[PDB]
Design a protein around this ligand. Structure first.
Ligand SMILES: O=N[O-]
Ligand SMILES: O=N[O-]
Ligand SMILES: O=N[O-]
Ligand SMILES: O=N[O-]
Ligand SMILES: O=N[O-]
Ligand SMILES: O=N[O-]
Ligand SMILES: [Cu+2]
Ligand SMILES: [Cu+2]
Ligand SMILES: [Cu+2]
Ligand SMILES: [Cu+2]
Ligand SMILES: [Cu+2]
Ligand SMILES: [Cu+2]
Ligand SMILES: [Cu+2]
Ligand SMILES: [Cu+2]
Ligand SMILES: [Cu+2]
Ligand SMILES: [Cu+2]
Ligand SMILES: [Cu+2]
Ligand SMILES: [Cu+2]
Ligand SMILES: [Cu+2]
Ligand SMILES: [Cu+2]
Ligand SMILES: [Cu+2]
Lengths: 299, 299, 299
């Protein structure tokens, strides 16, 4: 634990977003050091955006230019932001912001989909593994062909956790935990961090007969994901959330590290449905969420 | 070795299946403890369906409802069944059957493809790793567009084996063996277990010039598979065996854990053709099968 | 270090190719033992084709029959060649050539794409891991639908390096290095070996606004690749380089071991753009290349 991080636990700060034109959006995040309970009794003093790991959800429209400000609250470590959604010059636009400073960077989100974002400061592995990852969704101008069939939707993110700030482990060791989190799209949706237990104890909710859409991304840092919902089959899958990349009837979706998808499936009966990576060593180490399906859709 | 499993070696029992209506099929399996030779001189006292690991092949038609009975012969461990093919309530329909009891569960197979099945009892990793995995094929109502080109077909399954019933190894260790097995579709086809040697010593057979279809699934538990046939290219691939997910001219097919495919390729010359996962550490640890191609198609 | 390899460092020999008919091409390679600097201060006495690892690039046209000669310069180890592009009998056409001998083998390249080649001598893992891997590109007769949009193109290959000639490490250990190399398509293109530094210090070059095509293959031996270019999104992707396998708007391309692709992306701003596998443990261990984009396209 970096001497200047000892005892530091910066309270989470809300994401700030506001539209400033028909095709322009302001976003303001922080980089901050925040204690997160990743397993019961296990605190990780994470490197975060806004005190969440993964960070807060960003949603924009295809064709929006993002005017992004990062306020670095870390007392000693520089941080930066890399959005996979955007076309940008990495050496000009994804550059470091020093402690106690801010930086603003502008770039377009030209492509629909479910994109990873993460800090881009060398060593990138260190910043991602310590918690500086997240998702930005870019909504397609023309929608998805199955939009009218979807009854309910959520966002799920997979990540790993390693021994604390240990570059040897990050490079060469198996993950200690692999976890899901959910980030809110609409008021009332849960908003959680990557931990082994919250989405088991407080399942996502749905109603019998519904078609559910999940926007998913496996942020890694290191593992691929074999994404599967127990008790159903994916009716439709759009790789990276691009409407053109359309598969049907998949049992399990292969996600690379940073890989995204939009997946849709029908829940036909009441009960609790596990959501896993089917790499079962990772599932055993935390990567199981639950979907509770009731006759009403409320608990 | 669980005290009540010491010395236990339950003889394999045939799968029971019978059609009971134009869209309804009965299946009866066992859960049982059976010694399997996974490498020469290496016995694994596997947790199995029907004394095979992977378990027996199930084939049904798209739109069939399955009335599935599990007879648990294990003297002490509960077991259950999860079919990836079906729409079901996991907490009602994939529940545990206690030792010396049976349970019956009914659910539809609405989607064509090559699906994993496995025990769903917590910890799922333990039940899969110990051998409780298999494949169910759901035949598409409308076939595949290349059906008329296929001359011969087989089923191949990839799995791993770890240190015996060792949850630490299952979670954190590399596999000791990675293996292929073949499960019979028609009388005379081989029916083998996941071992390092049988499909090398007794290759699958084909005839010069034939187009071969393989129904494949990588059941894991933990690894992905880079499926490749030496000396050919896949003419056509259907991801998860759904006819819509149609690729052409692939050298190697990426399978997630639990991932399936229908793959088709032409063998143009006499000889022996290795079949591998191209993750060559896994191939070296057992995952090489052989296809012997002769002028007649018989040995 | 095999006693007969001690002190051996065979100078690289150029690939020999010549067209001998409208649909027939001669290729002559060597198998040879050559010291390669894989990281600064770290020499690997590689098993190679032609003194390069990965080996030299081969480019042919769809429908060409290849008349391939391997001249084995290794004083003691037999070697062979397996081209993923071709239809061949592995047990007749991919056979070993003994030390100080040559062998010639003929087979057709019927399928367009970006194919791995490698030695096929048992244990195959040993020959691949020690450096005997490479790429053959088969150009599609009808092109790719986006050909007219591409301004500049390069070839990139990903491989791993392990502890020297250590079969235990090859089977059971994490890679010590994961690396990119580039192989020349046109005069003036760089031609490099798999190392941790050359494509950082001497980036690939491009011009602002260009659409870039990369022909890529992950030769392994053991890992999958999460291929990503920072600061852009792939406009179009053709899996295995087959024009039919067409995805759009992908952030990251999942490559199995031996998996290939043609990927295309636009660079909109001047700067330096990292090229990674997004499995960041591998990126940290060497697998980052750089693309320098200038107003002119020259350094
Ligand atoms: O039903 N999924 O194992
Ligand atoms: O089907 N999830 O084990
Ligand atoms: O020819 N497959 O290495
Ligand atoms: O092409 N199998 O090494
Ligand atoms: O912008 N790629 O992290
Ligand atoms: O987006 N490369 O970290
Ligand atoms: Cu407008
Ligand atoms: Cu602004
Ligand atoms: Cu950071
Ligand atoms: Cu990234
Ligand atoms: Cu509905
Ligand atoms: Cu009917
Ligand atoms: Cu019945
Ligand atoms: Cu079991
Ligand atoms: Cu499952
Ligand atoms: Cu035929
Ligand atoms: Cu001609
Ligand atoms: Cu010739
Ligand atoms: Cu060799
Ligand atoms: Cu190969
Ligand atoms: Cu252009």
């Amino acid at each position: 634990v970096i001497a200047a991080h000892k005892g530091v636990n910066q309270a989470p700060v809300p994401l700030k977003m506001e539209r400033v034109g028909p095709h322009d959006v302001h976003i303001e995040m922080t980089a901050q050091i925040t204690d997160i309970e990743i397993d019961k009794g296990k605190i990780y003093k994470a490197w975060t955006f806004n005190g969440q790991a993964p960070g807060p959800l960003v949603v924009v429209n295809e064709g929006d230019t993002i005017h992004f400000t990062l306020k670095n609250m870390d007392p000693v470590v520089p941080h930066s932001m890399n959005f996979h959604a955007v076309h940008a010059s990495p050496s000009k636009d994804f550059i470091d912001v020093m402690p106690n400073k801010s930086g603003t960077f502008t770039y377009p989100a030209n492509k629909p989909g479910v994109f990873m974002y993460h800090a881009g400061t060398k060593p990138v592995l260190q910043h991602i593994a310590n918690g500086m990852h997240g998702v930005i969704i870019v909504k397609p101008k023309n929608g998805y062909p199955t939009d009218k069939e979807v009854d309910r939707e959520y966002v799920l993110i997979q990540n790993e956790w390693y021994k604390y700030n240990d570059m040897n482990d990050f490079q060469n060791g198996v993950p200690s935990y692999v976890v899901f989190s959910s980030k809110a799209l609409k008021p009332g949706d849960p908003n959680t961090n990557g931990d082994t237990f919250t989405l088991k104890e407080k399942p996502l909710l749905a109603k019998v007969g519904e078609k559910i859409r999940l926007y998913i991304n496996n942020v890694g840092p290191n593992e691929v994901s074999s994404f599967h919902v127990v008790g159903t089959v994916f009716d439709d899958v759009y790789l990276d959330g691009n409407p053109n990349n359309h598969l049907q009837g998949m049992q399990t979706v292969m996600l690379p590290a940073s890989g995204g998808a939009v997946v849709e499936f029908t829940v036909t009966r009441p009960g609790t449905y596990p959501i896993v990576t089917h790499q079962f060593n990772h599932a055993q180490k935390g990567a199981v969420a639950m979907l509770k399906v009731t006759e009403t859709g409320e608990d």
